[PDB]
């Protein structure tokens, strides 16, 4: 059963299914990309990620400020 020809057919089927899934992933990814509002290109991706990094930095700053205002000896007195 595991002949060389049977392996060729399996490999071709898997390659074609991979191309199909790649096209489906590309369509869904464009749909989501416009659904999220990110401009096309690589630099837009980096800019959005770094803006989110700044936002998360300020967020954890606020979080640690809360932790200090609740558990520190300076806040208690």
């Amino acid at each position: 059963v595991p002949s060389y020809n049977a392996f060729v057919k399996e490999s071709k089927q898997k390659m074609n299914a991979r191309k199909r899934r790649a096209q489906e992933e590309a369509k869904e990814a464009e749909m989501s990309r416009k659904e999220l509002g990110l401009d096309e290109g690589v630099d837009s991706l980096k800019a959005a990620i770094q803006s989110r990094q700044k936002d998360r930095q300020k967020e954890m700053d606020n979080f640690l400020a809360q932790m200090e205002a609740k558990y520190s000896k300076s806040s208690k007195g």
Binding site: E28, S32, M67, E68, Y71, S72
Partner: protein, 84 residues
């Protein structure tokens, strides 16, 4: 008294990683996403817990208080995204 904890990285189950990804907006995940997530979180936790334990040790205590973790996270915020 030599009790040891082991293989609790599996405590981060597949549903846990799925909830994290859905909170992050992920629609579909790869099969090998779970192991990568476990490794990333383990490295993160190791690097922050070492500093928290160092703070507790310098406090001449043996219990990690909340301010130990606060200072560990504050020190981590300076080195985590320093591009290396």
């Amino acid at each position: 008294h030599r009790k040891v904890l082991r293989d609790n990285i599996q405590g981060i189950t597949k549903p846990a990683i799925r909830r994290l990804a859905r909170r992050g907006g992920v629609k579909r995940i790869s099969g090998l996403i779970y192991e990568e997530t476990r490794g990333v979180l383990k490295v993160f936790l190791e690097n922050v817990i070492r500093d928290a334990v160092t703070y507790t040790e310098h406090a001449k205590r043996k219990t990690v208080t909340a301010m130990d973790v606060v200072y560990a996270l504050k020190r981590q915020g300076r080195t985590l995204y320093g591009f290396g």
